Ligand binder design. Sequence first.
Ligand SMILES: Cc1ccccc1CN1CCn2c1nc(=O)c1c2CCN(Cc2ccccc2)C1
Ligand SMILES: Cc1ccccc1CN1CCn2c1nc(=O)c1c2CCN(Cc2ccccc2)C1
Ligand SMILES: Cc1ccccc1CN1CCn2c1nc(=O)c1c2CCN(Cc2ccccc2)C1
Ligand SMILES: Cc1ccccc1CN1CCn2c1nc(=O)c1c2CCN(Cc2ccccc2)C1
Ligand SMILES: Cc1ccccc1CN1CCn2c1nc(=O)c1c2CCN(Cc2ccccc2)C1
Ligand SMILES: Cc1ccccc1CN1CCn2c1nc(=O)c1c2CCN(Cc2ccccc2)C1
Ligand SMILES: Cc1ccccc1CN1CCn2c1nc(=O)c1c2CCN(Cc2ccccc2)C1
Ligand SMILES: Cc1ccccc1CN1CCn2c1nc(=O)c1c2CCN(Cc2ccccc2)C1
Ligand SMILES: Cc1ccccc1CN1CCn2c1nc(=O)c1c2CCN(Cc2ccccc2)C1
Ligand SMILES: Cc1ccccc1CN1CCn2c1nc(=O)c1c2CCN(Cc2ccccc2)C1
Lengths: 176, 173, 171, 171, 171, 171, 172, 170, 166, 172
Amino acid sequence: LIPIVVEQTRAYDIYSRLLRERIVCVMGPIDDSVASLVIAQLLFLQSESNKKPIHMYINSPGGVVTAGLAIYDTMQYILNPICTWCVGQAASMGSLLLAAGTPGMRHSLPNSRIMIHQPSIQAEEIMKLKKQLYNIYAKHTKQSLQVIESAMERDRYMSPMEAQEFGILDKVLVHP
Amino acid sequence: LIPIVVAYDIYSRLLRERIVCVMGPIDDSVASLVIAQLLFLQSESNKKPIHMYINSPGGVVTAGLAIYDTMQYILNPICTWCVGQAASMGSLLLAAGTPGMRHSLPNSRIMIHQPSAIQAEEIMKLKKQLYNIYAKHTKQSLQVIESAMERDRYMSPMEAQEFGILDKVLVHP
Amino acid sequence: LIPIVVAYDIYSRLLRERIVCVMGPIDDSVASLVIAQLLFLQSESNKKPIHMYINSPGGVVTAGLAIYDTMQYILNPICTWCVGQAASMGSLLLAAGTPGMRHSLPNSRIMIHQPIQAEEIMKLKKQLYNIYAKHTKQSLQVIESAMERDRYMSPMEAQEFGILDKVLVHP
Amino acid sequence: LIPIVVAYDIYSRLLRERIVCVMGPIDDSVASLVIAQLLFLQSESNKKPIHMYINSPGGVVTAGLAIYDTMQYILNPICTWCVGQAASMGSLLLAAGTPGMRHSLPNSRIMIHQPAIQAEEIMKLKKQLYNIYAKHTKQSLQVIESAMERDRYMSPMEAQEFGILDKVLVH
Amino acid sequence: LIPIVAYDIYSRLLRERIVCVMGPIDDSVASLVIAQLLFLQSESNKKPIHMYINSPGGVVTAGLAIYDTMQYILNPICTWCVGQAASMGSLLLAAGTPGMRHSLPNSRIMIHQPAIQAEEIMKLKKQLYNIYAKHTKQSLQVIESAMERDRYMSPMEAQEFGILDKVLVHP
Amino acid sequence: IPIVVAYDIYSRLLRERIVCVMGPIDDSVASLVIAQLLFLQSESNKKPIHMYINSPGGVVTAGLAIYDTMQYILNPICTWCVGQAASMGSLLLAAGTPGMRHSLPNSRIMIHQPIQAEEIMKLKKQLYNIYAKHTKQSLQVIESAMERDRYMSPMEAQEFGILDKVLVHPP
Amino acid sequence: IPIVVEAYDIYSRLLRERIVCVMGPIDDSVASLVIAQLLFLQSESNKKPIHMYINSPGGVVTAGLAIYDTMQYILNPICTWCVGQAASMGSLLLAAGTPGMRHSLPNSRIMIHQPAIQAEEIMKLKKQLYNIYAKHTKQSLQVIESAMERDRYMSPMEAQEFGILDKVLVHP
Amino acid sequence: IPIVVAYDIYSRLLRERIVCVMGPIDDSVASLVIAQLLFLQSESNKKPIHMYINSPGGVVTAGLAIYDTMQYILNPICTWCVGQAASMGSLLLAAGTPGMRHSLPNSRIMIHQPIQAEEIMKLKKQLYNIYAKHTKQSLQVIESAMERDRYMSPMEAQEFGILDKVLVHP
Amino acid sequence: LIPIVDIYSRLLRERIVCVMGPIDDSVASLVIAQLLFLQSESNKKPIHMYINSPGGVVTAGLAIYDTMQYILNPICTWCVGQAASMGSLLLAAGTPGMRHSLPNSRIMIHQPSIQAEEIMKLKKQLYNIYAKHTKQSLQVIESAMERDRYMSPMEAQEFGILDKVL
Amino acid sequence: LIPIVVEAYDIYSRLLRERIVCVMGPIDDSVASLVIAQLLFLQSESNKKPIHMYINSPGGVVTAGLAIYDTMQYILNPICTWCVGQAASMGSLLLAAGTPGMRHSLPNSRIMIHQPAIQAEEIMKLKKQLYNIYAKHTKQSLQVIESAMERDRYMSPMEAQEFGILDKVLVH
Ligand SMILES: Cc1ccccc1CN1CCn2c1nc(=O)c1c2CCN(Cc2ccccc2)C1
Ligand SMILES: Cc1ccccc1CN1CCn2c1nc(=O)c1c2CCN(Cc2ccccc2)C1
Ligand SMILES: Cc1ccccc1CN1CCn2c1nc(=O)c1c2CCN(Cc2ccccc2)C1
Ligand SMILES: Cc1ccccc1CN1CCn2c1nc(=O)c1c2CCN(Cc2ccccc2)C1
Ligand SMILES: Cc1ccccc1CN1CCn2c1nc(=O)c1c2CCN(Cc2ccccc2)C1
Ligand SMILES: Cc1ccccc1CN1CCn2c1nc(=O)c1c2CCN(Cc2ccccc2)C1
Ligand SMILES: Cc1ccccc1CN1CCn2c1nc(=O)c1c2CCN(Cc2ccccc2)C1
Ligand SMILES: Cc1ccccc1CN1CCn2c1nc(=O)c1c2CCN(Cc2ccccc2)C1
Ligand SMILES: Cc1ccccc1CN1CCn2c1nc(=O)c1c2CCN(Cc2ccccc2)C1
Ligand SMILES: Cc1ccccc1CN1CCn2c1nc(=O)c1c2CCN(Cc2ccccc2)C1
């Protein structure tokens, strides 16, 4: 059951209430239906204002690569500062989106787990998709393409401090 | 669940802005909703553009043909936007946007290959319908379309632009 | 995921414009809903045309015939519109639209082939033959020979055969 | 996905016109709904006719008899209407409409054949259907009984000659 | 879909003090029927309540919970059997206010009973004998002997047996 | 199944003219029992055959197939009820050669019986005739008794004429 | 399946005594086994009779016709025996036994009613059944078709009066 | 199932007059056990028969079929509880020849027992009477004990009269 | 379950090969293994192919077809019950004058409901094989395969699908 | 059910006695295990006598197909490969891996080299080994193998012969 709250100018489900404050949730696996809901919200928040930051809450184990790339491209497309926030975990495509927040604006809570490994179409197309991920990670972490490729080979998570050192995020905060 | 904004679930909100979502697998039920919104949009104004957002793996040929024919029937300019992917019938609808208003975001993947109860001769008839639709809109010859469509591969947005599937690969407003 | 406009669900909105949707397989509950809408529309105006959008692979025969009979029963002209496909009972309903008001989009596919005891099945099948014969103006023997071939017709061939009157591209 | 019309869902709209739908199989939950509608409609006027649309392959016999008894109980004239088909208990409810107010559209199929209890209880129910059919068709028990053995359908005209319906309406 | 009249139809019948027991009895049904009974009693402790029963029976303890609520409320309760009232359903029918227990003409009535120990099964069965004996005024030997026989009673037989008071055709 | 000296133990019992009827009776049980009975008769149309019955009943026509085979062969057939013989199981038990129908002390026997209606009743009437014949009781008494959903103890089954002997030890 | 001595399974043992069991629903693999046995039994002797035990609710029509055609084909007289029931295709095989050698036990039930192909093909199959039933029962095609419309069974004795079988056998 | 050198191990135990009643009792188990009991009597009506019981119980009428068969054959029957004898399993254990009813030291024994009402009661009273006969407890005590959802140790069962010896070593 | 005399191996010892039921890869490799063993026993005496099949996998069928062509033995085909789709191709594929049907069988050359082009390539293989063995034209074969209908054995004889209606 | 024959022998075991190895289904670890065991066994019986390998397969697990391939290359015997019905994906690799001049197809077979829980990198590695294996045995260049394997299509037996997948197409 989604709780209902009231705003002062009607009842909103709590999620719609958070979208009213420019929070966009990316919890759970990323698939085509999640991507279209997230894209619709991002486009709608840009239209409400192309200056005001947008907050993206990420607690995701990854999901469909093309669905995550649609979200990422839409993030790059809008003009707004996008603050990304990792709670719980940001694994595979979820960490790509985390790393894709605006520079200086990528955050994790203290106990989150970050993974850029992609846990286990034609062979040549899987490798093309994978190289697309290498290029995106290189761009946003500032790591080498050869560092990104080697790191992604490793089946392991990063602490928030390591992800900060790696260049996936900027701040690990505890309180406001 | 679907958030509500300003009144409106957010998909209906984008519909009020002349955006029509073609996400996921195309089947008959997707076709009748798209056709429904396309026709309703043409009745709000036959001059204003309509935006078709496409992130689709393909689906039922006849359902896709039905959205195609509706796109060709309405007079409105139709801007097609490829986000994520447009494969099989998805890319036919992308290619079927108004000349010069067919776009892709930079990381999308576009496939014109068709990944593998009617008779053999009717499966061919449908296929030839697609060949001819692709040639009409990509301005490529049938020789190239039939040859290209045999290959189980994706195009990048720039190869797709060069082929005639779309006109613009854009990054920012 | 059915959107809202102005505040109707798009389908109700189309019904307000006198469009009745027959997409998908035809079963008893489709027929009930289609019949409900036709009667309601006739009650709104018995002369204003009614638009019937058909994109159907067919379905239950007696449910098809219930729709067919309700079409012949109401007074309104009915414009039938094939998008995608009209196969089996789908093409029977398309053929049954008011004469000269039967349409197809350019890329639709039309099939009159059909993909209780024996006697009763033949009985239904002959009911079909006769309805087709009436609406296409083809001889029973032609209809019967045509329905044995497992093939679709192009819209222009369907026009030729007498299933529809116009194959249009634009308004 | 039930259309709204103006505000009402279309079945409620029709119920407001004193139409009651009996489409699909008959079971206890269908009989409950049908009975509640007949009873409410009588409450609104015990004189205004009630239209029962029937497109049913039959169903539970005791659920059918519950509807039957409610029909016979309310004072309103009840016009029955066979669209598509009325088989087993469907045809019993059809025949049960007010004399002279039982109709069929031209292409419907009517069947009185019936395609957890003891053998004597099954016969005792069967015999109630003989009596009910004999009453409403004016045929003798031996004829009813002899016909109900035949796994076959009746055309609207045969059904009318038999006493099941009164009128075969084209439009 | 349940039709609307500002009211779904069942709620409409509840406003007229009708309570439907129209399927298998379980805890969920019992909870709903009890809630409706208590509510109707709070609207008026003198106005009759109508209990509609078309049920094959169900969970004994759940049937007994409804029974106890019928006895607890002061209101007259008219019980009406349509279709059937078997096992616990015929217990509730027999538990209507004396003189106010009805059946439509073609219903059938069964007092036969088509994890807990043997002794407990038997205690519940004896509770059923006692309750039937009270409301039918038959002896415990007669109740028990009758419930062994797997058979249905006609409305008339059920009247002679003390299960109901009136078998009626029309109002 | 164990091997004994080499045979599986049921085949070993088959060589001693023992045929087992354990479990529900269906057509494959019937074909297997019939095959064994016919084979045993061919080994000797005089030596007794022992039929061990522990069964809740089963398909009526399959049960009648065993019955007819039993009546067909010339051998004396000793029937032995261990555990239970219910419905068709107790028919076969009763159809043993007169003087040679047996039960163990704690078995339970039931003659109650837990296609179109006329056909279910034709089968039931056939069961009535067979039970009267082999219990040597009037058909009126069988028919009344079979309505009662209950078991008999071996002594009661003996008094009723279903069997001849209740044995504890080899007497 | 129990084993019997002079040592194998009871059903094969019956086969050696020229009995062929049609004891369940008829489908293609049952038709295949039956035909195999029939053709085998003719090889062992083309004159000795063959016993076909039928207890069957029917089954696939073309599978039943395969068995029928094999019965008319082989030279041996074929004695059909109904135990339990013979409905739809089961009764057609019953009635197709050699004239004077079609039996039932007393309490059998016999039914000729028939409780992805086009309508036309289903009718053609139905007419084939009429022709075969008319043949072996000596009844008129008009009467056979009237009979098959009725959802009912016949006692062994009325199946005899009808022409489906020749003897209602109590004991030997 | 391993073959030894009567070659599969279960059949080999049958040659030494052992009958296995392991697992739930249903009609098919009853039929096999009865067949072996009858077969063993035919080999000899004097040589003891050993019945190994490790059962949670099962279908009551199937259990009474085995019980009647044990009471029918003339052999001494030694019953042996390993693991557990619950519900019908403990009836069979208690039905061994007086003096020859055994348990292993860690077995658990339950006489509790985890159609129309009257018929269910009838079956229960048959159980009461069988237990009273072989345990020599009163029907009063038996019926009370069968209400309690509990197991007994082998010694408690011996003192109850369900068995005669709690065996440790041969 | 299968009687012992098993009844299938027995019929194999007399050069009968059963193609009853749907044709898939497993059926194909059994039939082929039996055709090759049968030819190996003698490349001269005939082989009987018993056929009651609704069809099956086209490449499984063609594998059987190609092995029938390959072996030198004559092949009597017999249709009991039905030979539809691939089944009727194997029927027509027996030695000319050695193709039979029993009187009530049903025969169907219609194919009741990989890339589109590969579907059509297979379909044209069938047109050609049918044209060969029936001595009909590719045009009539194609118009015939379009109709969803069965042929009586007598029609299948007229058509060239078989020779003798025993 | 697998016919038996006297030479006793289920008909597959009979074929194996004549040095025929069947590979006539989807290829997986279990099939590969059987095929390798038979190949090794046939070699032990005679490391000169040719071995016949029948192929009617839609492909299967790559690593299982490569295990069969490596075994073919390891045994010294000549390996005649025969394609009936179809050899697709890994099946066509084994077909092309028979001894030069001893790769055959029946006239109506269909041949496909197209490939209808591991990382992107490892899938590329496997596809590379298939390019190399196909290049070696067809004699085509790596470029030609790669672009031909991208096309979702079947070759006829003559196309496959001229492509270098097989040596002979024969009717009888
Ligand atoms: C969206 C919206 C919602 C409520 C009110 C106003 C608006 C403003 N509109 C109207 C139309 N439109 C708007 N904004 C937008 O960004 C876009 C459109 C149309 C197309 N397009 C391309 C695109 C870019 C990236 C992902 C996918 C598609 C972006
Ligand atoms: C649809 C609508 C919705 C809200 C308000 C006004 C309207 C205007 N109407 C009314 C009727 N009608 C309208 N427009 C349309 O385009 C069409 C119709 C009717 C029929 N027809 C054929 C067609 C064409 C292509 C795809 C399938 C069918 C198109
Ligand atoms: C339907 C309606 C809905 C909203 C407002 C007014 C109305 C007008 N009414 C009221 C009752 N009635 C109306 N029209 C109609 O055509 C019909 C009826 C009743 C019966 N009947 C027979 C029939 C014909 C063919 C298919 C099945 C049944 C047609
Ligand atoms: C029903 C209704 C609904 C909205 C407004 C007013 C009313 C009028 N009331 C009130 C109570 N009552 C009414 N009518 C009726 O026919 C009946 C009742 C009560 C009982 N009873 C017996 C019965 C007959 C046949 C089937 C089952 C039960 C019929
Ligand atoms: C229930 C109600 C509903 C709407 C408005 C007013 C009321 C009046 N109240 C309030 C509390 N209460 C009422 N009536 C009642 O009969 C009862 C109660 C409370 C408890 N109790 C015992 C009981 C008896 C038998 C079945 C189960 C429980 C009966
Ligand atoms: C059966 C058998 C088995 C092993 C050795 C010899 C035999 C002897 N045969 C051979 C054929 N036959 C024999 N006995 C028999 O009783 C019967 C037959 C044939 C037919 N028939 C009618 C029948 C009666 C009742 C149930 C069903 C059918 C009885
Ligand atoms: C069958 C058999 C088994 C073991 C030993 C010898 C034999 C005798 N053979 C050998 C081959 N053959 C024999 N008999 C036969 O009737 C037939 C054949 C071959 C073909 N054919 C046509 C046919 C007719 C109707 C249904 C299907 C097929 C009948
Ligand atoms: C069983 C056997 C096996 C191999 C060799 C010889 C024998 C001896 N026979 C032959 C037949 N028969 C034998 N013994 C027996 O105790 C019994 C029989 C027959 C019947 N009957 C009644 C019974 C008792 C209790 C449970 C169920 C049935 C006991
Ligand atoms: C088969 C057999 C079985 C038992 C004993 C001896 C033999 C004779 N051999 C030995 C090997 N071999 C034999 N015959 C044959 O026809 C064939 C072979 C080997 C290969 N080959 C090609 C082929 C043809 C068509 C379908 C598929 C493959 C035919
Ligand atoms: C196999 C066999 C079977 C029956 C009789 C004699 C033999 C001969 N042996 C005995 C052991 N051995 C034999 N042959 C062989 O080729 C091989 C071995 C052992 C190991 N090895 C490596 C290998 C090669 C390729 C695939 C996997 C493993 C090959």
